[PDB]
Design a protein around this ligand. Structure first.
Ligand SMILES: O=C(O)C1=C[C@H](O)[C@H](O)[C@H](O[C@H]2[C@H](O)[C@H](O)[C@H](O[C@H]3[C@H](O)[C@H](O)[C@H](O[C@H]4[C@H](O)[C@H](O)[C@H](O)O[C@H]4C(=O)O)O[C@H]3C(=O)O)O[C@H]2C(=O)O)O1
Ligand SMILES: O=C(O)C1=C[C@H](O)[C@H](O)[C@H](O[C@H]2[C@H](O)[C@H](O)[C@H](O[C@H]3[C@H](O)[C@H](O)[C@H](O)O[C@H]3C(=O)O)O[C@H]2C(=O)O)O1
Lengths: 407, 410
């Protein structure tokens, strides 16, 4: 197709784009750009909106980007020195399918009013991808990246991004990633959050809030995060092969489980300071007849192959128990987990019903039922305690995370 | 305020409008107009986008309107001789409040593909108004006018519009008005549909589909409509003072009740050819533990003062009963209703539980339980049987329905 070198969102609007067209935004700092990337491409010929030189096309002031259409690719942009007046910084519309944003950044794009809500990235539509991006420094109301649910699963892919430091919001709505809302929580989303770094994401209790079904949070790093990866609403979610490395940092929590048929496996939950709701593996108590926005009993959780090391509290069965939250976790199993150099191996706030605890290993002098002394050889490679027969280089050591043009 | 005189959507894009401005789109037929009416007005000084003369600014080809802002008024435009390529023809964004569309039309604006889905008017946000508009001739997939539910009630108002002929679509998605989806059915909408005419809206089973709560379908005319006003999902909805005049036309139905705490009162249900689900008042059976998209047991239905005349079937109690749908209507009352010159006055498919049926007058020789012999309380005025003391001029006989610039007649 054609290559169009532009220096304004107006020029992009006065353009008719066909598959294979590439729009190149001139390098520089462009203020108050309302970009509407509205076009349609194909798998073999997508329409591309790329920066002249990666990381050198800045959108300052009140600049926004809307991605509207099929097979669209946005590449190399940086939103800094500004804020949005009302809309989300980056938006994929409901009719936007098979589109992607890559090598892009949103840095300190904060509203002067800390209570003024907007998200930095909103995902809608189907099979859209956010990759090799950088979202750092959100100080105002609103989750950084939202996956907005619909009647059909989205199969969105959020991968290889760097979610930088997010200061404590003080109130709810400060998550890094929220997948769904309580109304859409009984719907399947099928979102994949994979190979991302969540560095110092302290916005609120939940770094990731899963509020829909069949999502997968796989092989990510949660580095020194004041929060937890929570299974808030919904069923059939998976939290696997992740590294939650709090580095002894205050209130660094693990994985919080609420709802049914969840799989928590292969995670490294090390150097965590949290307890109760922020335990390395927190299994919550729930209400009898809950509305969507409330708490659903933990039924059939499958917690296997997790290595908890150097932490305050490893497992908390029945966390959050009170007058309304009396229902204990039921069914499922807690098998083949390791709990080393952890002050509390297992806490029980509510006796579980039929939760099978067996073949777990700990270095604790006192073995709680279902735990034995450590029999497998362990190794501390790349700062992480791993099984000597399953030692691997963590993804961030051998892959580029965040923009390609950055370091 | 400022008065702008444009002839293109490109001119509108370059205009920086403030509370009190009025943009006047020049008389003519303009094709492929992508109208983005983005502005913020006030209650005292609104921002109007008006046609030079109502009905004389035509948007043909692939034209679309987006109403994105506060206190905005769109007035006098016609969408015809074209179709939407992807988007709904007229849209109120989720960021829109206190905005209005009046004296406007969408006429046979059909995509060449009958299965291609887009709505003609889409409502989002809150306190928005669609009035004095003409929506006629939808042949392709999709509900004509949609109220899209959100987390807070909308309080939208749909009034004095003319919804003209809609051919049968043959599948779901052929409603005239859908207020919500089963996902949002337990949410309050607070939408009002009042003083509109639904003329020959044969799109599908439901002329109007209520899939949310606290809605009011009041004082409308459904003339020769192949379908029903269905309380599909949601509770506390009201269907009152409507004229459902089938005029003997094949499968013309009435009001279909599903769910809880609904009110059905003062309706004239006459010349209906429908039975079972399409009876004048059809009170459905339901599943024991249903999902939000299925059928919820009819609880506390309050059916009073309905004048059912010249129909195939008056009331069907337990309509749609099957092996799954066994829960019958419970509680509430069916009282002060009139059923005259009707083949089956009241049919009972599933025996109701605790349903009060008293003071219902009819002319059928064998009086059913809770029915008394009708006297001379009713009179046939304007071709509509009415209670003598309550005789009135129908709203459509004395009000402009549809655009002010159009001399419409059924
Ligand atoms: O440990 C906890 O996290 C927790 C403990 C407390 O006891 C509370 O129960 C607390 O509840 C929160 C839950 O996440 C709950 O499902 C719900 O979420 C709301 C909340 O407003 C979110 O910020 C959010 O927002 C959406 C949503 O559509 C909302 O209705 C509104 O329109 O705004 C948007 C938006 O753009 O942000 O999601 C909501 C939702 O899922 O319904 O309430 C929370 C709360 O009350 O704090 O959990
Ligand atoms: O109207 C009926 O009598 C009816 C009978 C069928 O047996 C079935 O239960 C049917 O389901 C329809 C109903 O409107 C549901 O709420 C649902 O609706 C969705 C549908 O795709 C529709 O076009 C619109 O988009 O609303 C959707 C929603 O989820 O609300 O399905 C309908 C269907 O035909 O399956 O009602």
């Amino acid at each position: 197709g054609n290559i169009y070198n532009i220096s304004s969102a107006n020029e992009l609007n006065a353009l008719k784009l066909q598959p294979g067209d590439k729009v190149i935004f001139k390098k520089g700092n462009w203020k108050n750009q309302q970009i509407n990337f509205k076009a349609n491409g194909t798998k073999e010929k997508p329409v591309v909106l790329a920066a002249e030189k990666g990381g050198e096309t800045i959108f300052s002031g009140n600049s926004n980007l809307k991605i509207d259409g099929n097979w669209l690719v946005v590449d190399g942009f940086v939103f800094k020195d500004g804020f949005s007046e009302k809309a989300d910084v980056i938006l994929f519309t409901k009719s936007t399918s098979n589109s992607r944003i890559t090598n892009s950044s949103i840095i300190n794009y904060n509203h002067p009013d800390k209570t003024f809500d907007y998200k930095w990235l909103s995902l809608n539509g189907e099979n859209n991808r956010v990759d090799h991006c950088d979202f750092t420094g959100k100080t105002h109301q609103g989750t950084t990246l939202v996956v907005w649910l619909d009647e059909k699963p989205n199969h969105h892919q959020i991968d290889h991004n760097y979610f930088g430091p997010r200061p404590a919001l003080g109130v709810n709505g400060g998550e890094t990633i929220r997948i769904g809302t309580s109304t859409w929580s009984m719907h399947d989303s099928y979102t994949l959050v994979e190979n991302n770094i969540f560095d110092k994401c302290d916005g609120e209790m939940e770094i990731i809030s899963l509020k829909s079904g069949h999502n997968t949070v796989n092989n990510n790093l949660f580095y020194e995060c004041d929060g937890t990866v929570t299974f808030r609403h919904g069923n059939y979610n998976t939290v696997s092969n992740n590294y939650i490395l709090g580095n002894g940092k205050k209130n660094t929590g693990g994985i919080r489980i609420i709802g049914e048929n969840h799989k928590v496996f292969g995670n490294y939950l090390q150097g965590l300071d949290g307890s109760g709701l922020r335990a390395a593996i927190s299994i919550m108590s729930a209400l009898e007849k809950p509305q969507l926005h409330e708490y659903f009993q933990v039924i059939n959780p499958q917690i296997v192959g997790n290595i908890i090391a150097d932490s305050k509290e490893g497992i908390d069965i029945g966390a959050g128990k009170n007058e309304k939250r009396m229902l204990p976790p039921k069914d499922g199993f807690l098998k083949n987990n390791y709990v080393i150099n952890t002050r509390t191996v297992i806490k029980t706030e509510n006796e579980p019903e039929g939760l099978l605890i067996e073949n777990n290993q700990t270095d604790a002098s006192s073995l709680p039922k279902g735990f034995t002394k450590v029999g497998s050889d362990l190794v501390k490679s790349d700062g992480i305690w791993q099984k000597k027969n399953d030692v691997k280089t963590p993804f961030w050591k051998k892959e580029k995370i965040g923009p390609e043009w950055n370091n």
